[PDB]
């Protein structure tokens, strides 16, 4: 179905927009580690 797909996209676009959370919040440790050095 198309609402199976709308749901399956939205959740997936959730996972990505989770990863880019994890990433964005390293980048701002890295921009902490860079503070010291």
């Amino acid at each position: 179905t198309w609402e199976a797909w709308d749901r399956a996209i939205a959740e997936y676009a959730x996972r990505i927009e989770x990863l880019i959370x994890a990433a964005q919040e390293q980048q701002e440790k890295n921009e902490x580690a860079l503070x010291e050095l």
Partner: protein, 36 residues
């Protein structure tokens, strides 16, 4: 300092694809609805 400023530029580009991916999907949904 440049590499970190850059991984940031990769991160940045991906975020911009994420908005562009959602825009393509909007288009698709408008076509789904119009054509069905």
């Amino acid at each position: 300092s440049g590499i970190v400023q850059q991984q940031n530029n990769l991160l940045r580009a991906i975020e911009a694809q994420q908005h562009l991916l959602q825009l393509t999907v909007w288009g698709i949904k408008q076509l789904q609805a119009r054509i069905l």
